[PDB]
Amino acid sequence: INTITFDVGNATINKYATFMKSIHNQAKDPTLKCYGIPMLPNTNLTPKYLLVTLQDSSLKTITLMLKRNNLYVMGYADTYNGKCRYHIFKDISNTTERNDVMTTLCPNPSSRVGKNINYDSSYPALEKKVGRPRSQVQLGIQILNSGIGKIYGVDSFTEKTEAEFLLVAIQMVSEAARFKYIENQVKTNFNRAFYPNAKVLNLEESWGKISTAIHNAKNGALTSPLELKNANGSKWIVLRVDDIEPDVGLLKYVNGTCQAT
Numbered sequence: 001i002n003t004i005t006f007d008v009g010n011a012t013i014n015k016y017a018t019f020m021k022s023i024h025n026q027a028k029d030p031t032l033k034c035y036g037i038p039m040l041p042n043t044n045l046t047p048k049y050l051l052v053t054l055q056d057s058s059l060k061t062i063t064l065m066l067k068r069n070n071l072y073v074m075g076y077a078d079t080y081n082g083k084c085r086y087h088i089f090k091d092i093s094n095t096t097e098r099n100d101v102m103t104t105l106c107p108n109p110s111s112r113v114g115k116n117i118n119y120d121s122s123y124p125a126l127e128k129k130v131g132r133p134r135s136q137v138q139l140g141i142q143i144l145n146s147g148i149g150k151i152y153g154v155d156s157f158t159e160k161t162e163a164e165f166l167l168v169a170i171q172m173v174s175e176a177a178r179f180k181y182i183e184n185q186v187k188t189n190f191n192r193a194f195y196p197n198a199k200v201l202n203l204e205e206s207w208g209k210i211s212t213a214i215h216n217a218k219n220g221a222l223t224s225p226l227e228l229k230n231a232n233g234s235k236w237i238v239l240r241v242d243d244i245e246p247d248v249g250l251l252k253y254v255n256g257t258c259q260a261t
Contacts, residue, residue: 001051001063001106008145009057013187017142023177024249026050027068033257034215035241039251043069049104052173056148060255064169065105069253071174073121073166077105078152084112089121119159121166129163133199137167139186140193144168171196175204181247199236202229203247210244211252217241217259 002028006019029041029052044066053063064076074097075088084106092098101261106112119125127133147165151157182200196204203210206228216223220241228244230236238244 002052003053005053007055011141013190020183024069033173036261037248037251040069040253056145060152061146061197072168074101077209085115087115087117089117091120122158126163126167129159134167138193138195139168143193178250179203180249197231198229198233199231212254214241215254
């Protein structure tokens, strides 16, 4: 719990941009890249996880634990009464993962309470909970800041207040780090709440396929054009890595050799 902190309460663009470069610099494999784009490491490369602390305007704090190999959030922690309260997702199930998650988040026994999250850590599960597709749930720097207050130190919040905060934090953190395009959308709408546009949604949903495509590209040309959606909703066919390259920040891990540059 020696972590990367983002002060959402007094965020500035230059602040958020440094917060993303920190995650990008700890999450990326030290050597693997494809066409200049860094790639995430295999699961055996320790640190296996990353801790990101989000702090609000009242110095309240919430730390998220992410698997480094893929950037998916495993659970989070806050402070309840005078103890570390870890909340893990229902889908985190290897028995060696939820304990690593519990003891990394709150490393002192009998000074921690568990408040398991009874649902899966995946878009459908969370959309279900808030009851509304993520396209209708706004994102924003003041939105994330408030979310923190609905959670920290309160014993009953609602699975809807919590899933909602998570949907926001996952995109403004994991999706933004994986895609330069999403980060730029946040930065572009920093001083306002906004809805993810057709392309932020398609990219989040297309991360694995985009990563395989770019890993497999021969001499810079995709082995198979890719049909993606663009901002305003229309088809968008990328035939080359340089067509998509400016939008991607971190490639999923695909084992094998690719054109380093």
